[PDB]
Design a binder for these strands. Structure first.
Ligand SMILES: [Mg+2]
Ligand SMILES: [Mg+2]
Ligand SMILES: [Mg+2]
Ligand SMILES: [Mg+2]
Ligand SMILES: [Mg+2]
Ligand SMILES: [Mg+2]
Ligand SMILES: [Mg+2]
Ligand SMILES: [Mg+2]
Ligand SMILES: [Mg+2]
Ligand SMILES: [Mg+2]
Ligand SMILES: [Mg+2]
Ligand SMILES: [Mg+2]
Lengths: 110, 155, 107, 41, 166, 97, 101
RNA sequence: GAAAUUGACUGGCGCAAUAGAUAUAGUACCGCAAGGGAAAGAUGAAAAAUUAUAACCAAGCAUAAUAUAGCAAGGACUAACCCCUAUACCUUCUGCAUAAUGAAUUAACUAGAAAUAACUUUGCAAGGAGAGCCAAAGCUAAGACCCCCGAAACCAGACGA
């Protein structure tokens, strides 16, 4: 009998040292000899792409979806995707967290 | 007939704020709530407890200001009426029928905390003049004079 | 037909507009459903347009009830004890905005 | 007998609610009523 | 079929406050499936509407109709149930508030005509309904007086307005 | 009055039966199974209506041609009469010629 | 249209007036102004310096539904339509005159 | 209207008491006979609970007859009428308020079926289609178009003096 871990949230705040951590990661995965434009190195090799994306996913808790994996052509793009924040909440909570005027009342009978 | 409080969609603080805003008056919130709380509602709710501030000061202030201010408007616009006629016009404007009609179509009854529904006309008149007293305490004599001018000379 | 329906004379609520204008709309109750394709337009209206309407009309209390229903509705309560129940079933967001504004300007 | 009409009551009653204040059988019998509501409009 | 007249008899009321009128007793009775026409029974009921109970019994006793005898029996048993179960004080202190006749369940028989022709006979049946109310019979409405006629004419003349103008 | 006085009893449907959960499976058996089979031989029904559409007269002709021999006497008589009527109607009546 | 208005009056305009409710506007094309003991007559319009009318948009509503039915007999001709005309209720507040004759 | 030749179980986008079998039944009833041929029933877990809260809904009536004047209304109006306007409907027709047709009214049932092409939208394309067929942009697939009732008659086999 295997226990199931509790359900993870999709809330992902982009960390402040995303630049320096991406530097660390690209350094162990693509080797010590960096091209000066580390921005613009290709991800055409699927093994190198798997290693980089899997390391980033296991660190940051955020995984690139299958509909964006083909888009993930450069670590430029990978930096863009991990820069983009995604947010998880019920939208009843979203409508409440939006600054409601005092004459508007929301009830959630669900 | 059942009161709008026991009718489903209701929120008392929102209704009080909308009352002040749709009357375009900067009411004090606690003063308005105490102007809507009546003594009979007080007595019914201790009785329910065995199984705070009333209208009276605000009602008396609003009533006295209504008499004085209405008499002032009437005898300034019509200098030739004698005192009996000015007094009778003032008693008509602060009478039961006119004040209850104004309170009902301004929805003082919906916000009135009382014992019986429909609200008895004496209770509704007292609640309306407590609202007048709250407006006098919150805004000032000229502003509540404009309020009285509108909502009674229009009658 | 005039002979088959009631009639009345032109009137205001309490001599409205003489001293000051009082908005006769008091309450708006929006029954909307989370999962209803009929309620999609009202869902968009609650998402985008109800905040600005509530800010523009501070004298009106707006309740929004998200509950499982097939026909989304709006109930407008007016100061003289009037109640108007209207179906916003399968209406776009601009049609709902036009209707809710029209209810606001009614007596 | 698939696909019978089930809201014939409501169609009859919208014509009859326009015909309600008439005199005779034309305020309640649908045939005579619908011949008169049209003329009224 | 429906028996709401009997259920009306079995309706009950809350207890009375000591400071309000006495709420006079109401007694509902009916007879069903009377071998008689509802129109003729209507003539008898319209005769005994609004009478006192004894006045109705006298009129039905000296009328010459089968419906009159049947209605007399129904009135007697309604009076008996009135002062036996509904706490009517005096058996003469009742009047007929409602008295009407309805259609009953009829039967279709053939009526042989000439040639090969035929008709359908209707073995007509009817119901009789009565309501007895405790108290003296209400006074008949007095006929309209010339003073009242002049008054209503003056009221129309004073209710006239200037139409289709400001 | 032609209308119910009470609500009809609720018509609950299981959207996840065997039949609904597995509707449509193997409908691409020809183009995903080296064309050894056909959907027209996936179809189960009457023996004269397996992979064939037709209008009414064609259906009646096909039924009489295929299962005419092993058919009941009055059913075959009604089928002969129906074919005769449908022939007359389709070849002799209508708006367009 | 020509409206004979006074102060504290109500009129019903049969179209929308692109104004918010409770909005104070000035009516200008004054054909006539008058009191007891005197009237002033424009030719055909009075001076805007001479007379002002003040009105207030107090209601923006719709009319009751109007039926348009067309019927021609023995020709199967039968047509129904429902219209709701927009309307605007104005309260005439004040009528002011200035000494300019 | 050919042929040679080719090769080929246990469910319901059914009905639910005017429907679905005519069927509760070939019974009742009708006819000498062959033969024709119906209608309908609805409580509850318990009726060894006959009770009383079930209604509300067609036509028809009752509660509750009527008041100068006129297709029965509409414009209206303080006001039901009084004032003003106004030649029922369908079919048929050159043309019908027609004193031409049909209809007492209510409920239910009761009348547009498809090819050849064309057009629109896809797929593939000098080829298209899961053989066969068509092809000087075509072929394949789908969509979309063709009613109901009624004679006097004619023939076959029975049943009847
Ligand atoms: Mg049957
Ligand atoms: Mg049958
Ligand atoms: Mg009826
Ligand atoms: Mg006339
Ligand atoms: Mg002719
Ligand atoms: Mg003519
Ligand atoms: Mg005639
Ligand atoms: Mg003739
Ligand atoms: Mg005729
Ligand atoms: Mg003819
Ligand atoms: Mg011949
Ligand atoms: Mg012989």
């Amino acid at each position: 009998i295997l226990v199931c871990p509790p359900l993870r949230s999709r809330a992902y705040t982009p960390p402040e040292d995303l630049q320096s951590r991406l530097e660390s990661y690209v350094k162990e995965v693509f080797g010590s000899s960096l091209p000066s434009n580390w921005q613009d190195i290709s991800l055409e090799d699927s093994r190198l792409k798997f290693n980089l994306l899997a390391h980033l996913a296991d660190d940051l808790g955020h995984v690139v979806p299958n509909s964006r994996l083909h888009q993930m052509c450069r670590v430029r793009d990978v930096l863009d995707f991990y820069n983009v924040p995604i947010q998880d909440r019920s939208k009843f909570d979203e409508l409440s967290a939006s600054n409601l005027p005092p004459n508007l009342k929301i009830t959630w009978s669900y | 007939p059942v009161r709008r409080s026991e009718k489903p969609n209701w929120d008392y603080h929102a209704e009080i704020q909308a009352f002040g805003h749709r009357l375009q008056e900067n009411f004090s919130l606690d003063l308005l709530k105490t102007a809507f709380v009546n003594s009979c509602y007080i007595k019914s709710e201790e009785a329910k407890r065995q199984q705070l501030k009333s209208n009276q000061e605000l009602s008396e202030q609003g009533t006295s200001f209504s008499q004085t201010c209405l008499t002032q408007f009437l005898e300034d616009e019509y200098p030739d009426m004698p005192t009996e006629g000015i007094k009778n016009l003032v008693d008509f404007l602060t009478g039961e029928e006119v004040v209850c009609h104004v309170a009902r179509n301004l929805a003082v009854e919906q916000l009135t905390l009382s014992e019986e529904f429909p609200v008895p006309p004496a209770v509704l008149q007292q609640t309306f003049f407590a609202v007048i007293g709250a407006l006098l305490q919150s805004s000032g004599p000229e502003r509540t004079a404009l309020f009285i001018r509108d909502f009674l000379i229009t009658q | 037909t005039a002979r088959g329906t009631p009639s009345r004379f032109l009137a205001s609520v309490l001599h409205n507009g003489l001293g000051r204008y009082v908005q006769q709309l008091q309450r708006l109750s929006f029954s909307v459903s989370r999962d209803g394709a009929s309620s999609r337009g009202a869902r968009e209206f609650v998402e985008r347009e109800v905040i600005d309407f509530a800010r523009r009309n501070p004298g009106v209390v707006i309740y929004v009830n998200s509950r499982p229903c097939c026909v989304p509705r709006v109930v407008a309560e007016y100061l003289n004890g009037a109640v108007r129940e209207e179906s916003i079933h399968c209406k776009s967001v601009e049609e709902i905005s036009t209707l809710v504004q029209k209810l606001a300007d009614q007596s | 007998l698939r696909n019978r009409v089930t809201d014939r009551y409501f169609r009859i009653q919208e014509v009859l609610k326009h015909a309600r204040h008439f005199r005779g059988r034309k305020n309640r019998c649908y045939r005579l009523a619908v011949r008169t509501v049209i003329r009224a409009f | 079929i429906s028996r709401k007249w009997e259920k009306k008899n079995k309706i009950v009321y809350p207890p009375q406050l000591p400071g309000e009128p006495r709420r006079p007793a109401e007694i509902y009775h009916c007879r069903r499936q009377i071998k008689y026409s509802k129109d003729k029974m209507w003539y008898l009921a319209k005769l005994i509407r609004g009478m006192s109970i004894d006045q109705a019994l006298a009129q039905l006793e000296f009328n010459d109709k089968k419906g009159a005898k049947i209605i007399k029996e129904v009135l007697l048993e309604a009076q008996d149930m009135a002062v036996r179960d509904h706490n009517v004080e005096f058996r003469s202190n009742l009047y007929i508030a409602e008295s009407t006749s309805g259609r009953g369940q009829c039967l279709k028989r053939i009526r042989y005509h000439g040639r090969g022709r035929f008709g359908i006979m209707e073995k007509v049946y009817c119901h009789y309904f009565v309501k007895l109310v405790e108290g003296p019979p209400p006074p008949p409405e007095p006929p309209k007086t010339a003073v009242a006629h002049a008054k209503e004419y003056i009221q129309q003349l004073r209710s006239r307005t200037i139409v289709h103008t400001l | 009055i032609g209308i119910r006085l009470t609500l009809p009893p609720p018509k609950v449907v299981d959207r996840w039966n065997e039949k609904r959960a597995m509707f449509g499976v193997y409908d691409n058996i020809g183009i995903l199974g080296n064309f050894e089979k056909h959907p027209k031989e996936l179809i189960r029904g009457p023996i004269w209506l397996r992979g064939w559409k037709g209008n009414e007269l064609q259906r009646c002709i096909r039924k009489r041609k295929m299962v005419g021999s092993r058919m009941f006497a009055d059913d075959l008589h009604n089928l002969n009469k129906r074919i005769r009527y449908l022939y007359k109607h389709f070849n002799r009546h209508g708006k367009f010629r | 249209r020509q409206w004979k208005v006074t102060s504290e009056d109500l009129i019903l305009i049969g179209n929308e007036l692109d104004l918010a409710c409770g909005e104070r506007i000035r009516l200008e094309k004054v054909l006539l102004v008058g009191a007891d003991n005197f009237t002033l007559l424009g030719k055909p319009l009075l001076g805007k310096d001479l007379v002002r009318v003040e009105a207030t948009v107090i209601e923006k509503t719709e009319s009751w539904p109007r039926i348009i039915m067309r019927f021609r007999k023995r020709k199967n001709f039968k047509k129904k339509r429902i219209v709701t005309t927009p309307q605007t209720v104005l309260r005439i507040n004040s009528i002011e005159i200035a000494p300019c004759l």
